[PDB]
Amino acid sequence: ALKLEADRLFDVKNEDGDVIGHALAMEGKVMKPLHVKGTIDHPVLSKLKFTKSSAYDMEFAQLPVNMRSEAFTYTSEHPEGFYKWHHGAVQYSGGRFTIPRGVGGRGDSGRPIMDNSGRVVAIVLGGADEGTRTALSVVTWNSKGKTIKTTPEGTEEW
């Protein structure tokens, strides 16, 4: 099991070059959280005309015809149980995606949450600590393709 995969997740950097978030190729578009003010570390992608979507904290551009194959697949069906992301397991219960407290922070915006078949279930934007866990503010799309934004009380943008 060599983890050999396409180029789908890219870094967004600040003025001095600190990675402050992430941008992803998914369903024919490059998208990154709007609140992440930096540049996409990619020679081709960082020259595209991005379209803003303030209501959803999203910013997207059309993937070059070529790259369109190197992308993630979205899925609007997320049963309760466990999911996976960069740091480990993400739990989905009670309409909310949570991770352990003290795990997420700056740099985690734009990271996808995914199921075992490898489909993206949601995109992280920030988190609101509640007890021994953190409730994530994510962007998801419903079966009819409608973008939805769930933001817990006290959410801090990552």
Curated annotation (Swiss-Prot):
Organism domain of life: Viruses
Sequence motif Nuclear export signal, residues: 40-50
Domain Peptidase S3 stretches: 8-158
Subcellular compartments: Virion; Host cytoplasm; Host cell membrane; Host nucleus
Active-site residues per Swiss-Prot or TrEMBL entry: 35, 57, 109
Region (Dimerization of the capsid protein): 79-89, 115-119
Region (Interaction with spike glycoprotein E2): 51-56, 143-147
Site (Involved in dimerization of the capsid protein) location in chain: 83, 116
Functional summary from the UniProt entry: Forms an icosahedral capsid with a T=4 symmetry composed of 240 copies of the capsid protein surrounded by a lipid membrane through which penetrate 80 spikes composed of trimers of E1-E2 heterodimers. The capsid protein binds to the viral RNA genome at a site adjacent to a ribosome binding site for viral genome translation following genome release. Possesses a protease activity that results in its autocatalytic cleavage from the nascent structural protein.
Domain notes: The very N-terminus also plays a role in the particle assembly process. The N-terminus also contains a nuclear localization signal and a supra nuclear export signal (supraNES), which is an unusually strong NES that mediates host CRM1 binding in the absence of RanGTP and thus can bind CRM1, not only in the nucleus, but also in the cytoplasm. The C-terminus functions as a protease during translation to cleave itself from the translating structural polyprotein.
Quaternary structure and partners: Homomultimer. Interacts with host karyopherin KPNA4; this interaction allows the nuclear import of the viral capsid protein. Interacts with spike glycoprotein E2. Interacts with host IRAK1; the interaction leads to inhibition of IRAK1-dependent signaling.
Name of the protein this chain belongs to: Capsid protein
Organism (species): Sindbis virus (SINV)
Covered range of the whole protein: 107 to 264 of 1245
